């Protein structure tokens with residue numbers, strides 16, 4: 132048939148995926164902060180921190196003790212802090228220390244302030260604690276500054292300003308069997324030509340909200356060190372080079388200049404138009420095009436607000452559920468599509484998120500093939516619309532051809548823009564495709580691709596971050612710390628040797644009083660704030676329960692039995708994620724790197740049924756205070 136014929140599409144998809152097989156896998160990238168050359172490393176530094184201001188506050192003392200240490204002061208760590216405060220667990224003045232390498236609150240929204248930055252999920256669904264702060268976002272999609280200001284709004288509202296230690300890198304988290312406390316080894320930056328302070332900090336509990344897209348990377352492009360013009364990563368934007376500011380997109384200092392951008396991910400989609408407006412020439416260096424769908428940015432309407440958004444108590448959680456029902460292929464028949472944007476048009480995104488509607492995939496080759504066939508057929512209509520949209524906007528057919536993405540929607544993060552594609556209709560903008568191969572080399576005046584050379588004045592690296600999957604999902608690797616628990620046992624060694632092991636994705640046996648936002652062995656939503664909502668609430672509620680059961684000062688530790696049962700649960704769901712086999716490389720296959728070694732690998736994945744289902748499971752689990760599978764006792 133016609134329908135079945137059209138899957139020679141999956142022949143174009145495997146050809147385009149093959150084109151970019153790299154035998155090195157993740158080995159092609161290096162963290163900015165680990166590059167040999169010091170000039171280069173310095174690109175990872177915080178451009179925004181006011182060291183004078185921070186250096187004048189009372190310093191945190193070496194040997195300080197707290198009830199809770201939270202690693203991370205972005206939306207995730209803020210949610211933990213707010214939840215602890217509302218649970219009645221953090222009333223005392225040393226009950227919370229938040230620690231972050233950033234110079235202030237916001238995480239993602241502290242570091243990234245490049246021109247054009249917006250959240251890609253609806254503001255009303257994404258910004259935390261809207262109902263509790265009373266804040267009304269200005270638009271459908273929030274810009275950086277509004278996002279950062281909201282982080283400040285939260286910290287202000289819950290009086291967190293004097294409970295944070297910034298500019299600080301955590302290196303080690305070590306449990307002490309004797310005193311029953313975690314010790315953190317921390318290095319606090321004090322500004323240029325000042326000595327850093329080495330700190331040892333102790334806590335009863337450590338809560339990690341260390342994030343997932345945290346460590347800007349660059350590709351190992353031969354001779355990149357040697358390019359002599361100004362270079363910067365989008366995650367550490369250089370407004371001195373560019374002109375403008377976080378709240379001024381007039382990039383006056385690009386006028387007359389020849390600007391290069393490596394990468395075509397969400398960041399490039401947002402930045403490219405802003406660069407085109409100012410630069411004399413803009414060269415865009417592409418290895419894999421994004422599928423660019425429509426955005427539909429809109430100012431908030433005050434009638435729509437009280438009628439259709441803030442509809443009642445608890446409205447935001449209901450809205451987040453509504454949005455995610457489209458992405459988990461679960462929207463019921465005549466339900467209201469509350470968000471009604473481009474995310475609600477991609478039901479094959481469930482390939483990578485889960486769905487509660489289709490059962491569990493049995494792990495026979497016939498059942499996997501049927502699952503994949505189903506998902507490929509589900510995706511076909513949206514995927515063909517994305518290519519057609521590109522076809523219609525981009526006037527030159529050669530450039531249109533290169534901008535078309537040929538992979539299932541689920542293989543990369545979808546991107547949304549009403550200006551990016553149109554930007555390539557401008558005369559000063561040149562797409563440089565690398566045929567799946569990437570940039571070849573650099574030299575003092577610019578880059579080389581297939582022996583042609585492209586001279587540049589200013590180079591922008593929109594080459595992304597260390598994958599969220601790093602270290603098979605090890606919470607240690609992902610946060611960039613060594614974690615040692617009972618008997619000096621290393622979290623990461625356990626993870627690598629025995630496989631992923633948690634209960635509900637948030638704790639591990641041997642590591643009492645440590646919790647982490649769930650990544651491995653849980654579920655995820657496109658809307659990360661939803662995940663953080665669910666996960667921070669579960670963690671704080673488990674701790675609340677345990678504290679209440681011992682009448683303050685608990686020691687809470689999942690058993691090996693309970694984590695191992697949960698891990699066999701996760702293995703049962705692994706067939707869902709055969710969906711990822713056919714993917715073009717990207718952070719979701721760990722650039723293609725993702726016997727019974729297979730079941731060890733399977734342990735690091737997720738439930739297959741979506742966020743709502745995981746959430747409900749946690750609610751039922753907490754309901755009777757039993758904390759089944761935890762060893763609870765008095766810490767003192």
Ligand SMILES: Cc1cc2nc3c(=O)[nH]c(=O)nc-3n(C[C@H](O)[C@H](O)[C@H](O)COP(=O)(O)OP(=O)(O)OC[C@H]3O[C@@H](n4cnc5c(N)ncnc54)[C@H](O)[C@@H]3O)c2cc1C
Pocket residue numbers: 202203204205206207208209230231232233237238239240243249250251252257299300301302340341342343344345398610611612648657658659660663
């Ligand atoms: C450019 C960009 C745009 C995005 N847009 C969206 C979106 O629209 N919707 C969405 O759902 N998601 C988006 N994301 C994903 C985003 O990371 C999450 O939505 C969210 O901001 C994460 O909150 P968090 O507090 O968990 O992590 P983060 O915001 O990453 O904060 C964690 C902080 O902890 C710090 N930290 C980590 N390790 C250490 C250590 N060892 N020592 C000290 N400090 C450390 C980090 O430096 C960082 O400051 C985006 C990500 C990026 C990078």
